[PDB]
């Protein structure tokens with residue numbers, strides 16, 4: 052068995068502080084979209100049929 | 113201000129310390145933690161509980177006496 | 188000497204165990220508040236009592252950090268609480284009272 | 293040698309937040325020092341961003357606030373942060389003061405008395421802030437409190453009419469309160485720096501009240517991360533009020549514009565003033581109510597003079613611990629009575645709780661420390 | 671001004687070029703992310719959630 | 723009985739080396755070896771063979787506070803590789819750059835080592851020394867110093883800053899100095915029959931052979947600035963040290979602060 056994922060994460064990304072920062076700023080970019088996309092999906096699901104974007108199609112023209 | 117090396121005089125005291133990268137940050141968190149929280153509450157519950165219970169009694173009585181004072185009577 | 192003085196001593200041992208500094212291994216004179224008289228008395232302690240006071244305070248501060256206490260076997264027994272600082276503090280106060288009585292004349 | 297230690301600027305930051313020797317055993321009750329600093333900064337940022345849209349004139353003071361919550365981008369989140377941040381400010385202030393009573397920190401006279409001045413100026417700040425939206429409670433809260441100053445003998449009315457700029461709370465009163473509400477938080481921050489100047493002369497107390505010079509640790513990383521964690525809990529408490537219950541602590545009357553003719557039925561302060569509002573109404577006399585109302589807070593400056601115990605902290609003083617929580621529950625009683633009408637039996641309870649407040653601080657708690665000294669034979 | 675012209679000072683520049691190039695990427699990616707700069711972000715696969 | 727058990731267990735012919743150095747032919751030594759050491763059980767004692775298992779290194783700190791002593795002693799180190807590892811040559815070159823200092827040295831401010839220069843100019847210590855202690859598959863690599871109670875922090879700061887400087891930004895000229903210091907140290911030490919006899923005996927147990935001086939020169943000449951940066955980072959950068967303190971050490975930095983001195987945020 053090769054070394055664990057956390058071990059290869061350290062030597063490859065976290066050892067240098069510069070790459071440690073590049074990992075964070077790149078991880079912040081994808082986390083924002085993935086979290087906002089998922090979080091909004093939970094809010095709209097809990098409030099199905101009540102928000103304006105659900106009743107929007109009725110008043111198209 | 114005060115600086116390290118000018119604080120006070122200590123002699124004959126040894127201190128052993130482990131690096132944080134070689135020990136657990138949550139060692140026996142529930143095993144020893146929960147018994148210690150029960151001990152910490154039991155050792156202080158008789159100091160803190162009575163006055164807030166005394167408030168809860170005054171709060172309950174005074175709110176009951178308040179409503180029943182304005183309600184009408186056959187007089 | 189009588190049954191009533193054992194009840195005054197009985198409540199003093201109760202308050203002692205209620206004060207709870209014996210649970211940290213401390214003694215009564217370890218807990219005293221350091222004013223100028225107390226600081227001088229501590230300054231006059233012999234080397235052995237000073238070093239013992241320092242480690243008990245250090246050990247109690249270490250316990251207070253962890254919110255822990257010692258086992259009951261290692262608590263300070265009320266009968267064994269040594270007033271190691273009172274004879275020094277009584278003499279420091281007596282000297283100050285003399286300086287304060289000369290200042291009146 | 294080391295740039296962090298020798299540079300004229302960094303050495304002050306280094307000797308305050310980095311290399312400061314701090315006790316190894318200070319508990320969560322010591323986190324409220326930094327949290328007060330955060331609340332003060334948080335109130336200044338949101339306060340400034342509200343001043344970019346608020347106007348201090350009666351014809352538009354109410355609607356300019358409405359203009360923020362409706363039209364301004366994220367104005368509603370900035371306002372409720374400001375209103376609830378003030379309440380979090382007073383939560384932290386009361387924990388901060390209570391920590392000092394219980395653990396004996398008041399023995400630092402200069403640090404403590406400057407704290408009393410910080411409590412008064414923060415109270416005066418929030419009192420003037422509540423006038424600015426110019427709602428019903430904004431007007432009538434200002435009326436009942438400022439009228440108390442007329443009870444001062446021989447200069448009462450002249451002093452009240454000078455603070456008003458007229459004959460009642462009016463246009464001139466609203467504008468200057470905005471100016472004073474602006475200037476004071478910076479005067480507060482400067483006094484908070486002197487508050488730290490006298491503190492670092494001695495270092496922090498600790499839960500035991502025993503000196504910790506034999507066991508000190510650097511403030512960084514141990515208490516930098518502990519204050520960051522504590523600050524994170526503060527944002528949780530604030531945002532729970534802002535995003536799920538922004539109208540819980542506020543009064544609905546303030547959503548009605550001011551009306552000098554129509555009086556609301558129940559004029560109640562914010563929760564952080566109810567204890568002192570109760571003490572005011574429990575005294576029948578007017579001038580006596582003002583003195584008791586001012587003595588309710590200035591009494592804190594007397595605690596160092598009323599310290600009888602040979603021990604500093606209440607940690608090893610059970611008989612004083614019970615009286616300490618009797619002071620909290622008695623203050624929780626005055627808080628409760630303050631938000632209730634002045635009718636039977638609340639009148640009698642408010643008078644008993646008022647006497648119990650001053651009796652606990654002046655008589656009972658000093659007497660307990662003496663009894664505790666005798667039980668330990670010193 | 672001309673103290674820093676020699677073999678050693680060129681060796682020091684060599685050793686810090688990989689680091690200085692990475693901090694520039696941290697600053698660049700941090701500037702694009704902080705401002706939602708659509709000129710660069712539109713080319714990234716997963717952050718195309720714009721719907722022009 | 724404990725001692726005789728220790729002797730019969732360990733003083734066995736396959737685990738000993740008869741070394742000699744000076745005016746003598748190897749024949750008469752080997753003859754004398756057969757003449758006197760033949761009567762010794764060897765090559766099969768019993769099923770009682772000792773074997774050295776690995777030894778765990780632990781990042782940790784031991785602090786013996788004693789304010790009666792006039793100067794503090796501090797020893798800080800990381801885990802070294804062991805006897806047979808080729809990295810010891812490059813490590814000794816890096817240690818030679820940092821070097822060592824004493825208050826009786828004449829150079830003072832003009833010394834090449836930045837730690838020695840700053841230590842002498844600002845009077846941060848009475849002495850310091852680097853070391854690379856070697857054991858089987860492990861070792862202690864670091865430095866030891868002694869200083870006034872108000873110089874423990876400055877001394878630790880300058881020391882760690884030189885480990886980090888060599889890990890990240892070592893230069894070619896100073897590395898040549900470390901190679902030249904090592905060449906002089908190696909030849910100056912093997913001067914006399916007793917040093918050479920020690921080098922023979924110890925090497926046969928550790929290396930299983932005598933490494934000629936010409937081979938040490940080959941490994942030293944292979945070292946350059948890139949080797950030092952790679953080799954120092956392999957053992958120093960972002961590693962948990964073992965710290966030992968003794969004396970007036972109130973100003974000895976906390977272990978977390980010491981651990982933070984093992985990396986640079988700028989790198």
Ligand SMILES: CCCCCCCCCCCCCCCCCC(=O)OC[C@H](COP(=O)(O)OCCN)OC(=O)CCCCCCCCCCCCC
Nearest residue numbers: 152156254386387389390391394499567607620623624627
């Ligand atoms: C003037 C303004 C009036 C406004 C009224 C506001 C309404 C009040 C609402 C009540 C909330 C109560 C907060 C929670 C209290 C928890 C207490 C606790 O956990 O137990 C007792 C604790 C014991 O800890 P020791 O340090 O003695 O020993 C520990 C060894 N394991 O001992 C301690 O930790 C106590 C430390 C001090 C806490 C301060 C809380 C009181 C706030 C108001 C004080 C105002 C004074 C003028």
Ligand SMILES: CCCCCCCCCCCCCC(=O)OC[C@H](COP(=O)([O-])OCC[N+](C)(C)C)OC(=O)CCCCCCCCCCCCC
Nearest residue numbers: 065066067068071072075076520523524700701704960985
């Ligand atoms: C104009 C546009 C500009 C945009 C720029 C965007 C940049 C985003 C951040 C990237 C910088 C990372 C720097 C870094 O990573 O170096 C900081 C430090 C390192 O971490 P480390 O000690 O593991 O050492 C690391 C050791 N290694 C490297 C060997 C693993 O990070 C920590 O320690 C501190 C982390 C804790 C976070 C909380 C701090 C906020 C304040 C309080 C918040 C709540 C109340 C206000």
Ligand code: HEM
Nearest residue numbers: 322324325326328329392397398407408410411484496497
């Ligand atoms: C804007 C208002 C205030 C701010 C920002 C502030 C901030 C601080 C800070 C950061 C500390 C050190 C850390 C800590 O002890 O938690 C401190 C300590 C202290 N403060 Fe305040 N404070 C304020 C008002 C007050 C008030 C109103 C009092 C009491 C009437 C007070 C009394 C004290 C005391 C006695 C200490 C020392 C505590 C100790 O060492 O244990 N301060 N303050």
Ligand code: HEM
Nearest residue numbers: 335336339340342343346371375378418421422424425477
């Ligand atoms: C210790 C600092 C501060 C405290 C405790 C505080 C407190 C308050 C409170 C409780 C209100 C009533 C808000 C409401 O009911 O809607 C208020 C209003 C206001 N404050 Fe502050 N404030 C502080 C600092 C500042 C600063 C520095 C400024 C200006 C730079 C400011 C500007 C305003 C404005 C414009 C209003 C009226 C808008 C509104 O009612 O939301 N505040 N303040």
Ligand SMILES: CO/C=C(/C(=O)OC)c1ccccc1Oc1cc(Oc2ccccc2C#N)ncn1
Nearest residue numbers: 418419422423433434437560561562565568569585
């Ligand atoms: C302008 O009125 C503001 C009020 C408020 O609660 O602001 C936060 C308020 C509202 C209704 C009634 C009164 C109000 O003001 C106040 C102000 C107040 O100030 C003090 C607080 C503590 C100790 C003394 C005083 C005084 N005076 N004590 C009680 N109520």
Ligand SMILES: CCCCCC(=O)OC[C@H](COP(=O)([O-])OCCN)OC(=O)CCCCC
Nearest residue numbers: 700701702703704705706707708709710711712
């Ligand atoms: C220093 C203050 C900078 C203020 C910039 C600003 O507020 O944001 C404007 C754009 C928005 O992204 P875009 O893809 O719409 O682009 C629309 C272009 N107008 O963001 C940028 O392009 C960032 C540019 C940074 C240069 C220093």
Ligand SMILES: CCCCCC(=O)OC[C@H](COP(=O)([O-])OCCN)OC(=O)CCCCC
Nearest residue numbers: 512513516517978979981982983984985986987
């Ligand atoms: C914009 C980003 C600024 C980065 C500054 C920074 O993170 O400070 C350093 C410390 C951790 O590094 P260290 O103290 O181990 O030093 C390492 C020495 N080699 O981090 C913290 O814990 C400090 C808290 C800062 C609060 C604002």
